């Protein structure tokens, strides 16, 4: 009953209620939660192996949202924002979760999370 035992998961969200609720879901599943207000603070505050849960609330006005290169990221969407799935997958997101999050769905997308593309002897 601890499917995230020994897993690190960051939650980047500008919303206090989403950061606290998602951190409580990560920890109840046996994971370690790293709460941050945005992508830069999630990269600075979370272990290098953490899966990044990134709130689509952090998108630009036209919906641009870049998952960090060489990291494993899942985007949090409203049901009305499902039209963005193809663009967010093309940007390098592993998958999506629909707000409000189901614990079982969070666990499955963290366990299956895949890397975005991207990341000397010559003196
Ligand atoms: N979340 C997610 N699923 C992916 C992804 N790629 C493929 N799938 C698969 O797509 C199925 C349909 O997902 P949906 O259309 O979002 O349809 C969903 C959605 O309406 C609802 N649902 C699932 N998870 C959540 C959740 O966390 N919150 C809320 N509010 N609804 C959820 O239940 C339906 C059935 O979900 P599943 O049985 O998991 O079945 C999912 C899942 O097995 C991905 O990136 N993310
Ligand atoms: N298999 C199953 N489990 C159920 C069902 N109803 C409740 N639960 C369980 O009860 C927990 C708490 O439910 P909640 O207070 O409604 O708290 C829920 C609720 O407010 C919301 N939520 C998730 N999916 C939906 C949905 O499809 N519709 C609505 N209206 N709210 C949802 O997200 C919260 C967290 O969801 P969970 O983490 O899944 O946590 C859920 C889940 O473990 C059900 O029909 N089937
Ligand atoms: N993880 C999760 N999944 C959710 C949640 N809300 C809805 N779902 C998903 O949506 C399906 C249909 O929910 P329903 O129409 O309320 O249909 C539900 C509902 O009528 C009832 N049910 C099951 N658990 C509860 C519960 O804790 N409270 C209430 N009041 N009804 C429940 O049994 C039906 C069948 O349940 P399921 O086979 O689980 O099928 C559920 C489940 O797969 C949620 O909060 N968390």
């Amino acid at each position: 009953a601890a499917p995230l035992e020994g897993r690190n998961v960051a939650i980047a969200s500008p919303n206090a209620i989403v950061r606290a609720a998602t951190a409580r879901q990560i920890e109840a599943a046996g994971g370690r939660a790293y709460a941050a207000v945005d992508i830069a603070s999630a990269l600075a505050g979370a272990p290098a192996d953490a899966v990044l849960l990134i709130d689509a609330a952090l998108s630009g006005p036209r919906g641009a949202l870049k998952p960090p290169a060489g990291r494993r990221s899942v985007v949090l969407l409203t049901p009305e924002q499902r039209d963005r799935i193809d663009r967010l997958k093309a940007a390098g997101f592993s998958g999506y979760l629909i707000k409000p999050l189901r614990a079982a769905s969070l666990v499955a997308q963290v366990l299956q999370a895949v890397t975005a593309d991207g990341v000397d002897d010559r003196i």
Side-chain angles (χ1 to χ4, degrees):
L4 292 189
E5 178 60 6
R7 285 137 190 297
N8 296 313
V9 188
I11 173 67
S13 174
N15 187 300
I17 288 149
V18 163
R19 295 192 293 273
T22 311
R24 291 188 233 255
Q25 288 178 316
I26 288 159
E27 292 179 55
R32 267 192 249 65
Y34 298 85
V37 292
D38 61 23
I39 297 167
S41 63
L43 290 179
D49 72 346
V51 174
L52 310 176
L53 275 20
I54 300 176
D55 196 343
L58 293 166
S59 305
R62 282 225 243 67
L65 216 224
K66 326 289 171 207
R71 299 298 299 258
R72 309 176 178 249
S73 301
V74 183
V75 57
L76 279 33
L77 296 175
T78 69
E80 305 80 78
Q81 295 164 332
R82 290 163 109 119
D83 54 358
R84 299 190 199 176
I85 286 163
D86 291 336
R87 179 176 182 185
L88 290 163
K89 298 289 293 292
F93 278 103
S94 173
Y96 69 86
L97 288 169
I98 301 297
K99 285 177 292 174
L101 303 204
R102 285 172 189 174
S105 291
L106 182 155
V107 168
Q109 290 303 312
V110 171
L111 291 191
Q112 299 167 10
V114 300
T115 329
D117 296 335
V119 53
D120 187 342
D121 283 11
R122 284 184 185 175
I123 58 154

